[PDB]
């Protein structure tokens, strides 16, 4: 769809050519508001039903109910059999609808941005339309400080010429400018002149991908429409008043959403491990069905050859023993329906939601500062259990380990260090010396070379409101140490050196301001002195400033002293930032000025043009000094990192500082402690892969096992950017890097790039396969969080993209420590126990039915009344599972926060595997066998009562059902170590409910609700067999579990069990300062 | 913790032992006489004399307090008679003479035991129409679509008792248990069994006496109720409510080998002597290798003579005692301390 033709006559393009249906034009729904939601209100039912029935289990339940609908498989009214499935579907639909409503409300708040598209024909009026702009056939004169709804080919502008500024912030970080439209120009007047006139035929090149290139054309009654002519999306600077132009290409969802916005979905590791268990249960059900079918067919053939009484009248087409075998298959599927998890998924989702709510309402991970009170939000209502299995953590230093509010510490001016900066500069500033002149120049370039805006509403104070923290810190420090930036109210800016209020002149702000590998931020200024000289001020990164200098006179000694000073500053954990000085002769200044003026608008590239202009103007810079600003680490970061290290969690840091200045920030973040060798790879006249392999050989090559892969109290690794780039370029280097990173616990990477961080996380997560976590604040952080198992965002001052595109939004790093340890550990333990006990109770029911099926010819007949079988996954035993999921604890949170070494069990995945699943299945089978066989052989008698009445199927069935409910509930209770009220209620409310149901349901007269069990209130509660069998089967079923649990606690204890015993029996122990505990710091 | 596991096991055993002893004692205070009359058609003498029954036909389960040994009981005898000059249902009489070694206490019950009879089969357990039996006006199409799938209707005339359970009603009766040697004269005394009270007075509610929406000529009797009703229901609808045998039979048994009550006695004591019970063999079970039986048993507090739960309790008590003693010995040998901080991962060398 490359070509599109526009603007025949008047807005509202009713007719261009053809009729409709092929070009997708003129309100043909070619564009619409961005849909971050799931479905429509009308189409909610089909998509919701498809999503629910794509879970295999739900389709199985629907098939079972539909089979029950037919009279061949029917037992009771369809309402009872369909009620559990309907309830499950309703709960799941409500949950997903709530999530979709949250997303839709967020999207609605984001959208509806006022847009001033005018021109409709009373003849003129209305305008101020909704964010959903009218197709591609209208124009908008969008005012100042308003976001762009779509791309546009702006023709004219309120300000002089058709120049505009948009400040692309959601797509980049640097400033923005335009280069006019061209031929339309003055002929393309706004304010109904575009409506009165009718010209131009807009031409387009590629609607699919247009980033940094949006070329086009237009012909009136050929013109080179370019990117610098076409505004793209979501960008608002508006240094002018308003800009008017025609909307083309995207209406709402064609350009920027195409550029980015692919959000994946994430699932926990526990669910992926649970899926094979569901498959195994389904396989068991199928095997039971086929075995029952075979045996029933054989027995029915035998019993129909010799006419029995239960095989009479089988000489039909739907009752012969073969179709009877098929019906036995179907009824085996319909009889053991509890084995396939019905309410497991809804219960797990509810438990995860409540765990996320607990993560929210926690008061230990809530940040209060300056009135606002950030809370740890769980943006993903799942993944609450993957926090407890974290084995790798990747972090970005700035904004996460630091407060992003740095304060000036040391300033170097020529040759003397200085240590709210007042120091000896006041005692040294004494005029008539070269050092004093250099100091004046240093302070001038620090106080002028910026983009800071100053507020003069408080005389004497003059508060500064900058954009980047470094500029604010530098300007405020310069003001406090003398030279005060008076302001930039007009084109002329003023300075407040402590003699007068002398002022400079602003001509050409080289506003480059970092990024694009161009970290210089120079600015051309002219003093209003009678000489009126033209001099250049510049500040930027160390490398660019040092490479842009001169190589004569004493400047060589100046440079070497400055380099030594820079190294000394970096050694102390400071961020370096140099300053420069350049003098411009008037003639070259004005020639370059006119060259820059005519190159500002070029309609071709202009990016490399501006860069080359900047590189050309800088030829005689003179070094003035080297500033050093310290980034304040957040309160609790060192302790947090130490505790994470004492959990087996590897802590990588991808910092944006230099290697030396970011060696754990001078070993202060506890990443690189004492007595731990650090490996440094810097690529100095050597191959990165060769150096890495040589270091690996030197430090671990003595190991025999390591050599197979090749075919001091700790270790670390440092690789800044180029080792990383070359490792990801090649394969063997990547493998060696992965090995050396696996065999260490603190990898510090300095001066990294977004793609490099994402590739680090991808490498670890893919090759290793272990759980990973990423935390940050910037856009690079949003990328590395999207490409990670669990993502964490910090609501820093750099923006809010990371919080939006992350699973969790913490405010502090210590909050990450607490969250991870206590919440992940508890969540993993609770989810594992809950899933295992759910499978256990389902297996108990299915096993009792199967053991009866041994003694019925394998005819797949339910021993229990269908009421008891239909209410197993609900009513009887769901509350204990929910209680285990919610309120269960293995140890109090104080112990977990004090001794992080207990994190081994959750990190190593010792709580949920397949051996535990097999153990719980076997336990269920054993207990079901005990219950069924003991009660059966108890009821193998004449009366089982004093009145002589016969023992029929339902008495023994009801006794076994009550016993099974008691056994399941007391098993779930026995697997609880956090008995506080609610678990009592669950465990003694399930069996209480079944007892009440048996008491009341058996007194309903046969006049209504036949009930098939009329009399069990007289046949069970009055029988000694029932009252002495249910406690016996309960005790015998629970005894092996009790003994095994006691022996595992005593003979072969765990660390968690031992610490639980220590806390319970010895409350007067100082965990933090005990010789055999955290006092050892181990 | 040992302090929570040894006392618990000891208490569990100390509680289990008396309960098991009581259950075993109650089961022991019960008598049971089992007589197999299935093979009475071919092996019994068909002349008028008697022959001692085979050893693997009768089983005596005497009480614990009885001094008479099992081997001291005379072998029961039987005879077979098939004379086609009596009413339908009593043509093949099997008379079994059995001896009661000691006076059976009051509350004596009579059961008939069936083996290899699968009432619990899926085709059989659900093969009954509750709404037809309750007497509500159920249309013919609903009968065709009901749970009485194999036996529903023929020629537009639905069966009143439909399904497989009603069709296979046990039509074998034992209308005599006579004492052949009493003490107070009366050379033969009949031990009066009452065929009322066999079923609990709550099963009769879910069976209607007479149906009102169909005339008593458009309903056909079940296929196997042909000898009892040769020309259909001429006397009216059968009173299924008022007969206890049908109600007892229409209660699906849990196991293939099941016993169903047939007549009971409460206020009479069975004397010591040789009796003679007449069984009207009309229900064939030999086709599917089934064996009928006659069970005369007394009742205790637990019920029948099944001392399985008591001995299971005793075995559990013995196991608990053994485990508790072993745990106490281990505690007294190596008393491992509580809160031991030497086996921790960061404490072990
Ligand atoms: C005590 O109870 C027992 C059982 O509870 C009674 O014994 C039963 O008595 C029934 C009534 O007389 C018998 O039914 C009759 O059987 C004869 C002959 O039997 C064979 O007939 C066919 C072979 O020619 C064939 O019949 C079908 O049998 C099955 C269903 O019955 C089918 O699955 C099978 O495929 C055959 O198609 C069998 O081989 C039989 O073995 C039949 O001719 C009779 O049919 C007549 O009556 C029916 C009634 O509905 C009618 O439709 C027909 O049109 C025809 O008029 C009838 O079925 C039964 O066989 C017999 N069973 C046993 C094991 O003995 C006993 O009589 C009773 N005694 C007392 C005193 O109460
Ligand atoms: C009692 O005698 C009658 C008639 O002598 C038996 O009825 C016959 O039984 C045989 C058994 O194989 C059937 O084949 C016949 O169809 C039956 N009827 C007739 C008219 O012969 C009856 O079975 C005998 N009762 C028994 C043996 O218990
Ligand atoms: C069964 O009932 C019959 C009659 O109801 C009882 O026979 C009576 O026995 C007493 C005591 O020997 C005699 O005085 C009567 O003359 C008998 N009456 C008849 C009609 O025979 C018989 O005793 C009862 N059997 C039992 C075990 O109680
Ligand atoms: C019982 O005895 C009477 C007379 O003593 C006799 O007429 C009758 O036939 C006997 N009944 C039996 C032996 O069943
Ligand atoms: Mg950052």
Residue with tokens 């008479």: B68
Token couple for A740: 């050396």
Please tell me the distance from the alpha carbon of residue A949 to that of residue A941, in angstroms, as a whole number.
11
Q: What is the DSSP letter of A193?
A: H
Give the β-pairing of A790-794 and A772-776.
parallel
Using the Cα atoms of residue B63, residue B65, residue B67 and residue B69 in order, give the sign of their dihedral: positive
CB A915 within 8 A of CB A832: no
Q: Name, in order, each residue with C-beta under 8 angstroms of B209's C-beta and a sequence gap of 6 or more.
A: B135, B237, B239, B240, B241, B242
d(CA A776, CA A766): 21
Per the DSSP assignment, residues forming a β-bridge with A411 are: A627
Closest C-alpha among A10, A9, A2 to residue A216: A2
Q: What's the CA gap between A53 and A58, in Å, rounded? A: 5
Sheet (strand A117-118) strand order: A117-118, A139-142, A243-246, A156-157
Of all protein residues, the one whose alpha carbon is nearest to atom 8 of ligand 1 is B224
B29, B292, B309, B326, best to mutate vs chain A, most A CBs in 10 Å: B309
CA dist A1043 and A773 (Å) reads 40
DSSP bridge pairs for B111: B261, B295
CB neighbours of A833 closer than 8 A, spacing ≥ 6?
Answer: A884, A885, A888, A911, A975
Q: Which residues of A touch B206 (CB under 8 A)?
A: 1006, 1010, 1014
**How long a stretch of residues is chain B?**
349
Alpha helices in A572-677 (DSSP H): 586-600, 607-617, 637-645, 664-667
- Two tokens, residue A465: 């409101």
Q: What does DSSP say about strands A216-218 and A625-630: parallel, antiparallel, or unpaired?
A: unpaired
Strand-pair partners of B220? B159
Which has the closest alpha carbon to B284: B92, B125, B123? B92
A311 neighbors B164 (Cβ within 8 angstroms): no
Burial profile A995-1025: b = 16 or more Cβ within 10 angstroms, e = fewer: eebbeebbeeebeeebbbbbbbbbbbeebbb
**Do A176 and A251 touch, CB atoms closer than 8 A?**
no
Q: Which of B:106-145 have CB within 8 Å of A?
A: 107, 109, 111, 117-127, 130-131, 134, 145
Cα–Cα distance for residue pair A384/A903, rounded to 1 Å: 15
Resolution (A): 3.3
- CB-nearest to B339 from A72, A314, A1062 is A1062
In this complex, the residue of B4, B206, B260 whose CB is nearest that of residue A1010 is B206
Burial class (CB in 10 A: 0-12, 13-18, 19+), A700: middle
Which residues make Cβ contacts (< 8 Å) with residue A4, sequence separation at least 6?
A23, A25, A136, A202, A203, A204, A207, A248
Beta strands A625-630; A717-719: pairing state: unpaired
Contacts of A972 (CB under 8 A, 6+ apart): A837, A840, A841, A877, A880, A881, A883, A884, A986, A987
Q: Which of A921, A957, A930, A954 is nearest to A285 (CA)?
A: A921
Q: List CB contacts of A160: < 8 A, sequence separation 6 or more.
A: none
d(CA A793, CA A400): 9
How many CA atoms lie less than 13 Å away from A372 in the CB half-sphere? 5
Reference A671, options A663, A679, A659; nearest CA is A663
Sequence-separated (6 or more) residues with CB below 8 Å from residue A312: B150, B151, B164, B167, B168, B223
Alpha-carbon gap, residue A214 to B55, rounded angstroms? 106
Could you tell me which residues come within 8 angstroms of residue B303 by beta carbon, excluding any fewer than 6 positions away? Answer: A941, A942, A943, A944, A945, A946, A1023, A1024, A1025
Nearest CA to ligand 4 atom 8: B188
Which of A593, A579, A582, A577 minimizes the C-alpha distance to A619? A582
Query: Whole-angstrom Cα distance, residue A979 to residue A118?
Result: 68
Instruction: Determine the 3-state secondary structure of A1010 from DSSP.
Output: coil
**A window 912-941, beta carbon within 8 A of B:** 934, 936-941
Question: Parallel, antiparallel, or unpaired: how do β-strands A650-655 and A747-750 relate?
Answer: parallel
Q: How far apart are CA A694 and CA A412, in angstroms?
A: 39
Does B152 contact ligand 3 (Cβ within 6 A)? no
Helix axes A344-361, A78-110, angle to 10 degrees: 40
Q: Write the DSSP string, A778-832.
A: SHHHHHHHHTSSEEEEE--TT-SHHHHTSSEEESSHHHHHHIIIIIIHHHHHHHH
- Between the alpha carbon of residue A327 and those of residues A71, A847, A867, A1011, B236, the distances in Å are 12, 21, 22, 25, 38
Stretch (H or E) spanning A373: strand A372-374
Q: Which DSSP letter does residue A910 get?
A: -
Tell which residue, A649, A820, A638, A665, has the closest CA to residue A744.
Answer: A649
For residues B14 and B21, what is the distance between their CA atoms, to the nearest angstrom?
Answer: 11
Residue A727 neighbours by CB under 8 Å, 6+ apart: A688, A689, A692, A719, A733, A734, A736, A737
| Distance in angstroms (rounded) separating the CA atoms of residues A1026 and A1020 | 6
CB contact set of A610 (below 8 Å; sequence gap of 6+): A599
Identify any residues that bridge with A504 across adjacent strands, giving them in sequence order. A493, A527
Give A298-329 as a 3 state SS string. HHHHHHHHCCCCCCCCCCCCCCCHHHHHHHHH
Q: Given B118, B248, B339, which is nearest A310 (Cβ)?
A: B118
Q: How far is the CA of B96 from the centre of ligand 3 (A)?
A: 22
B223 alpha carbon – ligand 1 mean position (Å): 7
DSSP A766: I
CATH class of A407-630: alpha beta
Distance (Å, whole) CA B336 – CA B340: 8
Domain residue spans in chain A? Answer: 344-356+821-1038, 367-402+633-811, 407-630
Give the whole-angstrom CA distance, residue A73 versus residue A69: 7
- In this structure, chain A runs to a length of 1082
Contact criterion met (CB below 8 Å) for A443 and A495: no
Inter-residue contact A860 to A328 (CB < 8 Å): yes
Distance, CA A214 to ligand 4 centroid (Å)? 121
Determine, for residues B344 and A309 on separate chains, whether the beta-carbon distance falls below 8 Å. no
Element spanning B111, H or E = strand B108-114
CB atoms within 10 A of CB A569: 26
- Alpha-carbon distance of A444 to A475, in angstroms, equals 10
> Of A213, A249, A240, A206, which is closest to residue A229 (Cα–Cα)?
A213
**How far apart are alpha carbons B195 and B145 in whole angstroms?**
35
Q: Which of A807, A809, A808, A804 is nearest to A261 (CA)?
A: A804
Q: Which residues, 6 or more positions from B49, have their beta carbon under 8 angstroms from its beta carbon?
A: B79
Does B336 lie at the interface with A, CB-CB under 8 angstroms?
yes
- DSSP 8-state code for residue B299: -
Query: B203 contacts in A (CB within 8 Å)?
Result: 1014-1015
Tell me, in angstroms, the distance from the centre of ligand 3 to residue B92's CA.
28
* Close Cβ partners of B130 (under 8 Å, ≥ 6 residues apart): A1010, A1012, B147, B206
Among all ligands shown, which has an atom nearest to the Cα of B284?
Answer: 1
Task: Tell me if B195 sits within 8 A of B112, measured CB to CB.
Answer: no
Cβ neighbours of B274 (radius 10 Å)? 14
Cα within 13 Å of Cα(A400), Cβ side: 29
Cross-strand partners of A680: A718
CA nearest A957 in B: which residue?
B254
Distances (CA, A) of B24 to A63, A592, A1021, B11, B70: 50, 115, 20, 20, 19
Residue A964 near residue A972 (C-beta atoms within 8 A):
no
**Angle (CA) B293 B297 B301, round 5°:** 140
Task: State the CB neighbour count (10 A cutoff) for residue B338.
Answer: 15
Distance in angstroms (rounded) separating the CA atoms of residues A778 and A793: 9
Q: Would you call B119 helix, strand, or coil by DSSP? A: coil
> Hey, which residues does B295 pair with through a beta bridge?
B34, B111
Structure tokens of B119? 């009432």
Q: Are A1009 and A867 in contact (CB under 8 A)?
A: no
Radius of gyration of chain B (CA): 28
In the numeric block, which tokens belong to residue A787?
């490409």
Query: Residue written as tokens 């990165």?
Result: A688
Closest CA to A278 of A229, A341, A235, A332: A341
> May I ask the CATH architecture of the domain A367-402+633-811?
3-Layer(aba) Sandwich (3.40)
- Other C-beta atoms within 10 Å of B193: how many? 20
Contact state of A1025 with B302 under an 8 Å Cβ cutoff: yes
Would the CB atoms of B256 and A855 count as touching at under 8 Å? yes
d(CA A218, CA A231): 16
The first and second tokens of residue A480, run together, are 């406090």
Asked whether the beta carbons of B96 and B276 are under 8 A apart, the reply is yes
Strands (E), A196-331: 202-204, 216-218, 223-225, 243-246
As a whole number of Å, the end-to-end CA separation of chain A is 66
B302 lies within 8 A of chain A by CB: yes
Is residue B189 lining ligand 3, measured as CB closer than 6 Å?
yes
Smallest CA-to-CA distance from A53 within A82, A23, A85 is with A85
Residue in A950, A1001, A1066 to test binding to B, most B beta-carbons within 10 Å = A950
Whether B279 lines ligand 2, by a CB cut-off of 6 Å, is no
Alpha carbons A171 and A695: distance in angstroms, whole number = 41
Extract the tokens encoding A16. 């261009």
Distances (CA, A) of B291 to A43, A180, A183, B43, B287: 65, 108, 111, 14, 10
Bridge partners (DSSP) of residue B92 are: B82
**What does the alpha-carbon distance between residue A237 and residue A176 come to, in Å, rounded to a whole number?**
8
Domain boundaries, given as residue ranges, for chain B: 1-30+309-349, 89-299
Cα(B114)–Cα(A46) distance, integer angstroms:
56
Smallest Cβ–Cβ distance between B134 and the set A941, A1006, A1032 belongs to: A1006
Q: Which of A942, A1054, A1082 should we substitute to test contact with B (largest number of B Cβ atoms within 10 Å)? A: A942
* Record: contact B261-A945, CB cut-off 8 A: no
Give the residues across from B297 on adjacent strands: B32, B109
Tell which atom from ligand 2 comes closest to the C-alpha of B284. Answer: 28
**A493 phi, psi to nearest 5 deg:** -105, 155
Long-range pairs for A414-418 at CB < 8 Å and ≥24 separation?
A: A414/A438, A414/A439, A414/A558, A414/A561, A414/A625, A415/A561, A415/A565, A417/A565, A417/A568
Distance CA A965, CA A844 (A): 9
* Collapsed DSSP state (helix, strand, coil) of residue B274: strand
Query: Tokens for A21?
Result: 């249906």
Cβ–ligand 4 distance for B185 under 6 Å, the answer no
Kindly name the residue from A396, A565, A631, A807 that is annotated as catalytic.
Answer: A396
Degrees to nearest 5, angle at CA A535 with A531 and A536? 165
Cβ B43 under 6 angstroms from ligand 2: no
**Which residues, 6 or more positions from B210, have their beta carbon under 8 angstroms from its beta carbon?**
B135, B236, B237, B239
d(CA A713, CA A676): 5
* A396 flagged as catalytic: yes
Q: Which of B292, B310, B294, B314 is nearest to B302 (CA)?
A: B310
| Cβ atoms of residues B83 and B91 within 8 Å | yes
If we measure between CA atoms, which residue out of B324, B320, B317 comes closest to residue B16?
Answer: B317
HEC per residue, A93-119: HHHHHHHHHHHHHHHHHHCCCCECEEC
Distance B179 CA to ligand 5 centre (A): 104
């Amino acid at each position: 769809p490359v070509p599109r033709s526009v603007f025949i006559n008047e807005p509202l393009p009713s007719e261009y050519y053809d009729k409709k249906g092929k070009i997708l034009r003129a309100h043909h729904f070619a564009t619409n508001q961005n849909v971050t939601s799931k479905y429509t209100v009308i189409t909610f039912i089909p998509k919701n039903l498809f999503e629910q029935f794509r879970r295999v289990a739900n389709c199985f339940f629907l098939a079972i109910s539909i089979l029950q609908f037919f009279p061949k498989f029917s037992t009771i009214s369809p309402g009872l059999v369909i009620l559990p499935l309907i309830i499950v579907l309703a709960i799941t639909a409500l949950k997903d609808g709530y999530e979709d409503i949250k997303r839709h409300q967020a999207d609605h708040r984001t959208n509806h941005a006022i847009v001033h598209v005018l021109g409709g024909q009373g003849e003129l009026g209305w305008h101020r339309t909704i964010w959903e702009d009218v197709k591609v056939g209208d124009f908008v004169k969008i005012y100042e400080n308003e976001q762009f709804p779509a791309d546009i080919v702006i023709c004219a502008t309120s300000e002089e010429e058709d120049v505009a500024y948009i400040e692309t912030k959601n797509l980049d970080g640097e400033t923005n400018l335009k280069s006019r439209n061209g031929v339309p120009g003055l002929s393309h007047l706004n304010t109904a002149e575009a409506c009165a006139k009718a010209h131009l035929c807009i031409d387009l090149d590629a609607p699919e991908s247009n980033m940094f290139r949006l070329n086009g054309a237009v012909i009136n009654l050929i013109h080179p429409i370019t990117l610098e002519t076409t505004m793209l999306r979501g960008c608002v600077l508006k240094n002018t008043a308003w800009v008017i132009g025609i909307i083309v290409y995207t209406g709402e969802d064609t350009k920027i959403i195409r550029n980015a916005g692919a959000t994946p979905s994430k699932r926990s590791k526990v669910e992926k491990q649970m899926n094979p268990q569901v498959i195994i249960n389904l396989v068991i059900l199928a095997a039971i069905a086929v075995v029952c079918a075979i045996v029933d067919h054989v027995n029915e053939v035998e019993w129909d050859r010799q006419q029995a009484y239960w095989m009479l009248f089988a000489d039909t087409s739907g009752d012969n023993p073969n179709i009877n075998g098929l019906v036995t298959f179907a009824n085996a599927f319909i009889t053991f329906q509890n084995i396939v998890p019905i309410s497991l998924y809804i219960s797990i989702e509810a438990v995860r939601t409540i765990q996320a709510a607990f993560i929210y309402w926690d008061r230990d991970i809530k940040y209060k500062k300056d009135g606002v009170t950030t809370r740890t939000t769980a943006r993903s209502w799942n993944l609450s259990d993957d926090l407890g299995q974290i084995e790798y953590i990747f972090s970005d230093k700035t904004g996460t380990l630091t407060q992003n509010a740095m304060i000036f510490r040391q300033c170097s001016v020529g040759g003397k260090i200085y240590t709210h900066d007042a120091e000896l500069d006041k005692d040294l500033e004494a005029h008539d010396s070269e050092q004093s002149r250099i100091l004046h120049g240093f302070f001038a370039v620090l106080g002028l070379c910026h983009t800071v805006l100053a507020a003069e509403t408080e005389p004497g104070v003059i508060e500064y409101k900058a954009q980047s923290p470094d500029e604010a810190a530098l300007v405020q420090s310069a003001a406090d140490v003398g030279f005060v930036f008076r302001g930039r109210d007009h084109n002329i800016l003023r300075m407040s050196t402590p003699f007068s209020d002398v002022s400079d002149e602003y001509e050409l702000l080289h506003v480059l301001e970092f990024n694009s590998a161009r970290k210089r931020m120079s600015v051309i200024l002219r003093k209003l002195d009678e000489d009126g000289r033209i001099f250049l001020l510049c500040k930027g990164a160390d490398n660019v400033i040092f490479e842009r200098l001169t190589k004569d006179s004493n400047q060589r000694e100046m440079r070497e002293k400055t380099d030594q000073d820079l190294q000394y500053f970096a050694s102390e954990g400071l961020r370096t930032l140099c300053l420069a000085y350049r003098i411009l002769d008037p003639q070259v200044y004005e020639q370059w000025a006119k060259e820059y003026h005519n190159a500002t608008v070029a309609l071709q590239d202009r990016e490399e043009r501006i860069e080359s202009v900047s590189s050309s103007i800088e030829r005689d810079l003179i070094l003035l000094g080297a500033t050093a600003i310290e980034d304040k680490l957040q309160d609790g970061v060192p302790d947090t990192i130490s505790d994470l290290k004492r959990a087996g969690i590897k802590v990588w840091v991808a910092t944006g500082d230099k290697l030396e200045t970011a060696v754990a920030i001078g070993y202060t973040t506890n990443l690189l402690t004492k007595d731990t060798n650090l490996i440094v790879v810097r690529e100095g006249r050597h191959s990165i892969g060769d150096q890495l392999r040589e270091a690996l050989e030197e430090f671990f090559g003595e190991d025999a096992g390591l050599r197979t892969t090749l075919s001091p109290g700790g270790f670390s690794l440092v690789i800044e950017g180029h080792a990383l780039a070359h490792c990801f370029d090649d394969e063997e280097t990547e493998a060696l890097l992965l090995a050396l990173s696996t065999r260490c616990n603190t990898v510090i990477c300095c001066r990294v790039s977004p793609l490099q961080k994402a590739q680090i996380v991808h490498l670890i997560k893919d090759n290793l396969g272990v759980m990973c976590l990423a935390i940050g604040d910037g856009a690079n952080d949003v990328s590395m969080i999207q490409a990670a198992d669990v993502g964490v965002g910090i609501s820093g001052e750099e923006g809010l993209q990371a919080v939006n595109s992350s699973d969790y939004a913490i405010a502090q790093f210590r909050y990450l420590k607490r969250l991870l340890l206590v919440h992940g550990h508890w969540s993993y333990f609770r989810n594992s126990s809950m899933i295992l006990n759910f499978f256990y109770k389902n297996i108990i029911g299915i096993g009792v039915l199967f053991w009866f099926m041994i003694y019925c010819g394998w005819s797949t007949t339910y021993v229990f009344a269908y009421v008891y079988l239909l209410f197993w996954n609900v009513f009887w035993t769901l509350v204990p599972v929910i209680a285990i999921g919610l309120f269960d604890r293995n140890i109090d949170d104080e112990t977990l926060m004090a001794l992080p070494e207990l994190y081994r069990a959750s990190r190593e995945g010792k709580y949920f595997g397949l051996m535990r699943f097999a153990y719980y299945i076997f336990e269920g089978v054993y207990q079901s066998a005990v219950i069924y066989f003991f009660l059966n052989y108890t009821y193998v008698t004449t009366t089982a009562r004093g009145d002589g009445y016969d023992v029929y199927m339902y008495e023994m069935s009801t006794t076994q059902a009550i016993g099974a409910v008691m056994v399941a509930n007391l098993f779930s209770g026995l697997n609880i170590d956090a008995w506080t009220g609610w678990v009592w209620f669950a465990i003694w409310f399930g069996p209480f409910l079944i007892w009440v149901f048996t008491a009341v349901y058996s007194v309903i007269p046969p006049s209504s609700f036949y009930t098939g069990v009329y009399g069990n209130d007289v046949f069970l509660f009055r029988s000694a067999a029932y009252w002495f069998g249910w406690p016996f089967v309960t005790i015998i079923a629970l005894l092996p579990r009790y003994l095994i649990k006691t022996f595992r606690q005593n003979i072969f204890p765990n660390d968690v069990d031992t610490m639980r015993l220590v806390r319970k029996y010895h409350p007067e122990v100082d965990l933090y300062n005990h010789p055999m505990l955290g006092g050892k710091l181990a | 913790t040992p302090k929570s596991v040894l006392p618990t096991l000891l208490i569990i055993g100390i509680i289990f032992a008396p309960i098991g002893a009581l259950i075993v004692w109650g089961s022991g205070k019960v008598t049971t006489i089992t007589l197999d009359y299935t093979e009475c058609d071919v092996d019994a003498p068909t002349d008028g004399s008697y022959q001692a029954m085979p050893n693997s036909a009768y089983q005596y389960d005497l009480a614990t307090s009885s001094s008479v040994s099992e081997s001291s009981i005379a072998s029961p005898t039987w005879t077979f008679s098939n004379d086609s000059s009596r009413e339908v249902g009593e043509t093949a009489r099997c008379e079994i003479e059995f001896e009661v070694p000691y006076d059976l206490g009051p509350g004596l019950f009579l059961y008939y035991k069936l083996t290899n009879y699968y009432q619990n089969h899926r085709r059989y357990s659900s093969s009954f129409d509750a709404t037809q039996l309750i007497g509500d006006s159920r249309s013919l199409s609903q009968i065709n679509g009901g749970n009485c799938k194999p036996i529903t209707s023929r020629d537009g005339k639905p069966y009143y008792p439909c399904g497989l359970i009603a069709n296979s009603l046990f039509n074998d009766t034992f209308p005599s248990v006579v004492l052949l040697n009493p003490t107070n004269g009366a050379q033969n005394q009949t031990y009066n069994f009452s065929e009322s009270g066999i079923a609990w007075g709550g099963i009769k509610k879910n069976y209607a006496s007479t149906l009102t929406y169909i005339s008593p000529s458009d309903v056909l009797p079940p296929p196997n109720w042909a000898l009892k009703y040769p020309n259909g229901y001429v006397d009216g609808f059968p009173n299924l409510r008022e007969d206890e045998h049908f109600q007892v039979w229409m209660r699906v048994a849990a196991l293939p080998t099941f016993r169903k009550l047939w007549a009971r006695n409460d206020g009479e004591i069975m004397s010591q002597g040789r009796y003679r019970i007449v069984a009207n063999m009309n229900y064939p079970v030999k086709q599917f290798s089934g064996t009928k039986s006659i069970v005369i048993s007394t009742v205790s507090w637990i019920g029948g003579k099944q001392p399985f739960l008591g001995w299971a309790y005793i075995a559990a008590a013995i196991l608990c005692v053994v485990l508790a003693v072993a745990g106490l010995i281990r505690h007294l040998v190596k008393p491992r301390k509580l809160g031991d901080m030497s086996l921790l991962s960061w404490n072990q060398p």
